[PDB]
């Protein structure tokens, strides 16, 4: 019960085969969630190269709504995986606690679950055993998908046992005898999760199990009047028993209900002694253009910043700005230099205040007269 620097507390639960325990870091006081995987139950091959493939594959899938995996510790008896811990419990327990939820919170959970399944589909992995008991809540009321790799190994081994244990969560293809589910189970499972977030109950519930399989094969479900008819078209386009008409991520991303309150970070791109390293500093601004145009570019830059400047030469410009909060004014002087016929250098020079005990700072306001100019010039 000690891995890394983590002691293990009381076991939370044993859902299918994995023993999930809370881990605690004695030094830093941080709560992690370890998962024990007995090799007796579901492991056929014991080659360490498979564990190396696990270490290479599973760690690099970083997403703000997927439970991140930290390391997979090997053991002669078991397999330990340190997933992150969240104190908000399962989604199904939250549904059983609060009943029917508001639409604005159900869409907020549904967008996060769909953007956690879209990250998996972009990174070529599916979550076949998706359910409200395998999505957790954090302290900040978000949605966290528990696993992606764990279902894939299990579903191939015992698809019939998984279907017998829960028919409603299992896909119509799996009960119809299709070999591999693929991503078509993911949108249908996110649809029954959306029906749980909109109505509280389960859409496909029976006591007698082959009649429940017949209810899965039937494309009908219950619909109350508590929910608006703008989302029932999405539910009918999402919960089809035939995967030819089942909704895609694009077919939800072009739907009207899904685009109402959508955060931008969910979808990345829509249209697509001492040792010190020496530094190479420059002098001014090196612009390879005409000298009559660089002064106009400097003019266009300093006109936007509301400065008060005068000239002496055609390339000697003594600028002066009044600070908003500080009553005094700061002065400096720009000058153009010719290092070669191609490039021209813009040199800054400060001048000292002679008589006035000005507050604030002298040279830091001098750098404030330049850090607003470099950004606008961008050269």
């Amino acid at each position, epitope marked *: 019960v000690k891995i890394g620097h983590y002691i293990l507390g009381d076991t939370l639960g044993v859902g299918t085969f994995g023993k999930v325990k809370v881990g605690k870091h004695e030094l830093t006081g941080h709560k992690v969630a370890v998962k024990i995987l007995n090799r007796q139950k579901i492991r056929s091959l014991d080659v360490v*190269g*498979k564990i190396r*493939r*696990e270490i290479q*594959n*599973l760690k690099l899938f970083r997403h703000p709504h997927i439970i991140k995996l930290y390391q997979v510790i090997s053991t002669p008896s078991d397999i330990f995986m340190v997933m992150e811990y969240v104190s908000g419990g399962e989604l199904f327990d939250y549904i059983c606690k609060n009943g029917r939820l508001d639409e604005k919170e159900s869409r907020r959970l549904f967008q996060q679950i769909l953007s956690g399944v879209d990250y998996c*589909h*972009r990174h*070529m*992995v*599916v979550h076949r055993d998706l359910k409200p008991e395998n999505v957790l809540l954090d302290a900040h009321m978000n949605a966290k998908i528990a696993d992606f*790799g764990l279902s*894939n*190994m299990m579903s*191939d081994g015992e698809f019939l046992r998984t279907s017998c244990g829960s028919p409603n969560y299992a896909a119509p293809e799996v009960i*119809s005898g*299709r*070999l*591999y589910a*693929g*991503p*078509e189970v993911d949108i249908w499972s996110s649809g029954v999760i959306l029906y749980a977030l909109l109505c509280g109950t389960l859409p496909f519930d029976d006591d007698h199990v082959p009649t429940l399989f017949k209810k899965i094969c039937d494309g009908i479900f219950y619909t109350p009047q508590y929910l608006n008819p703008s989302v029932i078209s999405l539910l009918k386009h999402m919960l089809q028993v035939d*995967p*030819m008409k*089942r909704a*895609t*991520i*694009k*077919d939800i991303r072009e739907h009207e209900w899904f685009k109402q309150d959508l955060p931008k970070y969910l979808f990345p791109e829509d249209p697509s002694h001492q040792g010190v390293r020496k530094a190479k500093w420059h002098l001014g601004i090196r612009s390879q253009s005409r000298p009559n145009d660089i002064m106009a570019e400097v003019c266009r830059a300093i006109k936007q910043l509301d400065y008060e400047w005068k000239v002496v030469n055609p390339y000697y410009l003594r600028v002066r700005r009044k600070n908003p909060v500080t009553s005094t004014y700061s002065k400096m002087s720009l000058q153009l230099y010719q290092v070669d016929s191609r490039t021209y250098l813009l040199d800054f020079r400060s001048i000292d205040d002679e008589l006035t005990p000005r507050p604030g700072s002298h040279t830091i306001e001098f750098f404030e007269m330049c850090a607003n100019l470099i950004k606008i010039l961008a050269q």
Partner: antibody
Amino acid sequence: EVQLVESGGGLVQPGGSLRLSCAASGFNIYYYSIHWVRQAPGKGLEWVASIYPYSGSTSYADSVKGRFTISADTSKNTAYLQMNSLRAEDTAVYYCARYYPYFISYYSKMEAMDYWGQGTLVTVSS
Amino acid sequence: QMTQSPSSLSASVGDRVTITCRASQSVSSAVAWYQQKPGKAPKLLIYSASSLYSGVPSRFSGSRSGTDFTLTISSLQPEDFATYYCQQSSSGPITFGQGTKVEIKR
């Protein structure tokens, strides 16, 4: 219950544009990349085209680069291989096949072609 | 961008054959094996060159030795007489093998 019925085959004139389809029935075409292959009589398989609708990225073999515009229609679950400027050598039977690029297991990134169609025979002759 | 090169052979019923596939460049474990009966559709046998596709039984087995992918057929039934195809899929372009045919011993 997955069947990949090809259509649009037959016999064409060289220098004529053909567009053969693949009615993907039994799954969703937006996730899986429909791949076409070339099977010359007596020779082996040869990959020609690919379109992946989920990321919107295609692929092409070096011998058919930029000449066979592949297209996929997710609304009718078809895959349109619009061939253009075909040579006399391009005379084969064209099978249709779905492609599963996903992690089937923790250790195995499956990258095979599961379900194959019957394949229509196109014959090019002057 | 690369090429493939299988072997070619012929053996009897129940014999244990092997088919190598020398990859040109360095690829991962992403090589499949397709059984095509003459005048039929190519059936998939082993997807990642080491693990068995669901369906066809455990007679077909594959081993990986660097960039030399193998296909071993133990206990050759009298129904598994067809043409076998190596298939590289890890890179951008997909290149099939030349295709080995298995003939009954006579």
